[PDB]
Enzyme design. Structure first.
Site, PDB file in Angstrom:
ATOM      1  N   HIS A 189     -11.852   1.145  -0.132  1.00  0.00           N
ATOM      2  CA  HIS A 189     -10.727   0.260  -0.382  1.00  0.00           C
ATOM      3  C   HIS A 189     -10.986  -0.787  -1.453  1.00  0.00           C
ATOM      4  O   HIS A 189     -12.078  -1.286  -1.657  1.00  0.00           O
ATOM      5  CB  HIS A 189     -10.343  -0.477   0.917  1.00  0.00           C
ATOM      6  CG  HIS A 189      -9.136  -1.341   0.663  1.00  0.00           C
ATOM      7  ND1 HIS A 189      -7.867  -0.857   0.484  1.00  0.00           N
ATOM      8  CD2 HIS A 189      -9.061  -2.693   0.558  1.00  0.00           C
ATOM      9  CE1 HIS A 189      -7.057  -1.884   0.275  1.00  0.00           C
ATOM     10  NE2 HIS A 189      -7.734  -3.006   0.320  1.00  0.00           N
ATOM     11  N   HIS A 234       0.815  -1.209   0.000  1.00  0.00           N
ATOM     12  CA  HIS A 234       0.000   0.000   0.000  1.00  0.00           C
ATOM     13  C   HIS A 234       0.854   1.267   0.000  1.00  0.00           C
ATOM     14  O   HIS A 234       1.887   1.297   0.660  1.00  0.00           O
ATOM     15  CB  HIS A 234      -0.828   0.088   1.278  1.00  0.00           C
ATOM     16  CG  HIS A 234      -1.850  -0.978   1.510  1.00  0.00           C
ATOM     17  ND1 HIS A 234      -2.266  -1.230   2.789  1.00  0.00           N
ATOM     18  CD2 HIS A 234      -2.523  -1.826   0.683  1.00  0.00           C
ATOM     19  CE1 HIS A 234      -3.166  -2.204   2.745  1.00  0.00           C
ATOM     20  NE2 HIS A 234      -3.341  -2.596   1.483  1.00  0.00           N
ATOM     21  N   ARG A 236       1.969  -3.511   9.748  1.00  0.00           N
ATOM     22  CA  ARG A 236       2.863  -2.867   8.789  1.00  0.00           C
ATOM     23  C   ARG A 236       4.284  -3.342   9.063  1.00  0.00           C
ATOM     24  O   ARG A 236       4.892  -2.909  10.047  1.00  0.00           O
ATOM     25  CB  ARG A 236       2.756  -1.345   8.945  1.00  0.00           C
ATOM     26  CG  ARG A 236       1.377  -0.796   8.546  1.00  0.00           C
ATOM     27  CD  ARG A 236       1.238   0.680   8.894  1.00  0.00           C
ATOM     28  NE  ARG A 236      -0.166   1.068   8.798  1.00  0.00           N
ATOM     29  CZ  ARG A 236      -0.643   2.268   9.070  1.00  0.00           C
ATOM     30  NH1 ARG A 236       0.211   3.220   9.441  1.00  0.00           N
ATOM     31  NH2 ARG A 236      -1.947   2.569   8.978  1.00  0.00           N
ATOM     32  N   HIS A 255      -4.501   4.706   4.156  1.00  0.00           N
ATOM     33  CA  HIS A 255      -4.215   4.532   2.749  1.00  0.00           C
ATOM     34  C   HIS A 255      -4.296   5.837   1.975  1.00  0.00           C
ATOM     35  O   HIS A 255      -5.227   6.596   2.185  1.00  0.00           O
ATOM     36  CB  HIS A 255      -5.241   3.589   2.116  1.00  0.00           C
ATOM     37  CG  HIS A 255      -5.223   2.210   2.684  1.00  0.00           C
ATOM     38  ND1 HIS A 255      -5.971   1.164   2.178  1.00  0.00           N
ATOM     39  CD2 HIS A 255      -4.511   1.714   3.728  1.00  0.00           C
ATOM     40  CE1 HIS A 255      -5.722   0.096   2.898  1.00  0.00           C
ATOM     41  NE2 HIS A 255      -4.831   0.392   3.858  1.00  0.00           N
ATOM     42  N   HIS A 302      -8.594   2.936  -3.342  1.00  0.00           N
ATOM     43  CA  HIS A 302      -7.779   4.051  -2.901  1.00  0.00           C
ATOM     44  C   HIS A 302      -6.654   4.224  -3.911  1.00  0.00           C
ATOM     45  O   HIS A 302      -6.227   3.222  -4.496  1.00  0.00           O
ATOM     46  CB  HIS A 302      -7.206   3.764  -1.522  1.00  0.00           C
ATOM     47  CG  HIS A 302      -8.263   3.596  -0.476  1.00  0.00           C
ATOM     48  ND1 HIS A 302      -8.102   2.718   0.566  1.00  0.00           N
ATOM     49  CD2 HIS A 302      -9.477   4.183  -0.320  1.00  0.00           C
ATOM     50  CE1 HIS A 302      -9.167   2.769   1.343  1.00  0.00           C
ATOM     51  NE2 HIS A 302     -10.018   3.649   0.830  1.00  0.00           N
ATOM     52  N   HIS A 319       0.659   4.631   1.835  1.00  0.00           N
ATOM     53  CA  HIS A 319      -0.014   5.302   2.935  1.00  0.00           C
ATOM     54  C   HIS A 319       0.224   6.792   2.779  1.00  0.00           C
ATOM     55  O   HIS A 319       1.193   7.193   2.118  1.00  0.00           O
ATOM     56  CB  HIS A 319       0.452   4.746   4.276  1.00  0.00           C
ATOM     57  CG  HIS A 319      -0.225   3.429   4.569  1.00  0.00           C
ATOM     58  ND1 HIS A 319      -1.129   3.288   5.595  1.00  0.00           N
ATOM     59  CD2 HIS A 319      -0.194   2.219   3.976  1.00  0.00           C
ATOM     60  CE1 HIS A 319      -1.588   2.038   5.627  1.00  0.00           C
ATOM     61  NE2 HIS A 319      -1.017   1.344   4.633  1.00  0.00           N
ATOM     62  N   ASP A 325      -3.860   1.736  -3.229  1.00  0.00           N
ATOM     63  CA  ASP A 325      -4.176   0.293  -3.207  1.00  0.00           C
ATOM     64  C   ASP A 325      -3.439  -0.484  -4.273  1.00  0.00           C
ATOM     65  O   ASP A 325      -3.889  -0.696  -5.416  1.00  0.00           O
ATOM     66  CB  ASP A 325      -5.708   0.182  -3.303  1.00  0.00           C
ATOM     67  CG  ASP A 325      -6.424   0.558  -2.030  1.00  0.00           C
ATOM     68  OD1 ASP A 325      -5.908   0.742  -0.910  1.00  0.00           O
ATOM     69  OD2 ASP A 325      -7.672   0.672  -2.114  1.00  0.00           O
ATOM     70  N   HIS A 383       2.745  -5.427   4.165  1.00  0.00           N
ATOM     71  CA  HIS A 383       1.954  -5.901   5.287  1.00  0.00           C
ATOM     72  C   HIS A 383       2.159  -7.364   5.626  1.00  0.00           C
ATOM     73  O   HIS A 383       2.689  -8.195   4.864  1.00  0.00           O
ATOM     74  CB  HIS A 383       0.459  -5.655   4.954  1.00  0.00           C
ATOM     75  CG  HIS A 383       0.019  -4.247   5.179  1.00  0.00           C
ATOM     76  ND1 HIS A 383      -0.379  -3.796   6.409  1.00  0.00           N
ATOM     77  CD2 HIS A 383      -0.072  -3.163   4.349  1.00  0.00           C
ATOM     78  CE1 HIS A 383      -0.708  -2.508   6.353  1.00  0.00           C
ATOM     79  NE2 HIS A 383      -0.544  -2.103   5.104  1.00  0.00           N
TER      80      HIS A 383
END
Ligand SMILES: [Zn+2]
Ligand SMILES: [Zn+2]
Ligand SMILES: [Zn+2]
Ligand SMILES: [Zn+2]
Lengths: 144, 146
Positions: A71, A46, A134, A63, A80, A48, A83, A120
């Site tokens: 999402h 992702h 994370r 995100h 997002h 962020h 994503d 992740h």
């Protein structure tokens, strides 16, 4: 052609480098590199919102969602900007990454420069996405 | 962007956090924070061009210089965008930083987000191409903050 790079680090064994190349203004963004020390299988991937590593990956915020969408996966319309789905680690814990994405950009409103790339603990279920902790992250920087 | 942040780290004891705030997109940037583990005295303080720390601070490249100027100090008109002068560490190795700069920006073509902040071994000579400040002791990529 703009380029960016991210060194992913965290408090455990996960670490890697991800490169970004955008040959054209608002063009597709190649994303490629390697992340190691992962458990075999899928790991959520992702962008962020904040390039803030003051509290490790925790300070990276949510995100990257400039469009206040829901999402989803990199193929979802309703996603997002940040994503990018999952990376797949092999039986040796290595995720060799090579994708293309048209929602992120190295310019303008979708720009990810200065934000945080995160890998992740678990798979993103892609529609947040329940990818768990994370494991490693880094600030996305301009590259030569 | 109105706020940014950078975590400075290296291979030695120098570490710190520097914050940036720019209230108005055509206005100055406030730069403030603290760096510790330094030797007492002056330490060159620069924004280098690339936010590439794949090879630690070396891969950050040269001073950020989008306007094609020569190296100077921060209050010189002839300077690079990345020329933030020197920070000063006290006898306990701590450099408290609190300055304003009107050449760096958090947006537009002077933008330093996604580039590398670097603190150096010794003083930048301020122009009297790099300032001869010695090795890069700590650095980090400048990121967008909340
Ligand atoms: Zn995430
Ligand atoms: Zn998302
Ligand atoms: Zn320097
Ligand atoms: Zn300079």
């Amino acid at each position: 052609a703009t380029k960016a790079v991210c060194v992913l680090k965290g408090d455990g064994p996960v670490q890697g480098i991800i490169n970004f190349e955008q040959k054209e203004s608002n063009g597709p963004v190649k994303v490629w590199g390697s992340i190691k020390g992962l458990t075999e299988g899928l790991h959520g991937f992702h962008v962020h919102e904040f390039g803030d590593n003051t509290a490790g990956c925790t300070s990276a915020g949510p995100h990257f969602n400039p469009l206040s969408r829901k999402h989803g996966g990199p193929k979802d319309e309703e996603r997002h900007v940040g994503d990018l789905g999952n990376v797949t680690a092999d039986k040796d814990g290595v995720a060799d990454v090579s994708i293309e994405d048209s929602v992120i950009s190295l310019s303008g409103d979708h720009c990810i420069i200065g934000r945080t790339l995160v890998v992740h603990e678990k798979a993103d279920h892609l529609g947040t996405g329940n990818a768990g902790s994370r494991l490693a992250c880094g600030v996305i920087g301009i590259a030569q």
